[PDB]
Design a protein around this ligand. Structure first.
Ligand code: HEC
Length: 71
């Protein structure tokens, strides 16, 4: 899975092109604040103002792993 391409397709409309926040909060350092599993749960299911379902399965897991290393 190309995790960065997925994030640019699916996440930047709310989180900003460089992930530093736009309508929604920054995620560029999400791994400093969340575990990989917490990030996966957010992607699959949403959280607070974020909807669920935006990515699934291996795509979601690859994005969670990529973000979890960003600190
Ligand atoms: C707007 C329709 C969104 C899209 C598209 C995505 N996210 Fe989001 N996200 C959004 C909001 C409004 C919030 C805040 C909810 C909260 O209280 O935390 C979030 C939050 C996150 C978080 C947790 C907080 C943080 O790190 O800032 C993460 C890790 C996150 N979002 C990731 C994420 C990814 C990877 C997305 C693309 C697959 C994605 N979000 C899309 C709104 C929206």
């Amino acid at each position: 899975v190309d995790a960065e391409a997925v994030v640019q397709q699916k996440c930047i409309s709310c989180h900003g092109g460089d992930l530093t926040g736009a309508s929604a909060p920054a995620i560029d350092k999400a791994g400093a604040n969340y575990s990989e599993e917490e990030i996966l749960d957010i992607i699959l299911n949403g959280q607070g103002g974020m909807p669920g379902g935006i990515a699934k399965g291996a795509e979601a897991e690859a994005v969670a792993a990529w973000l979890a290393e960003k600190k």
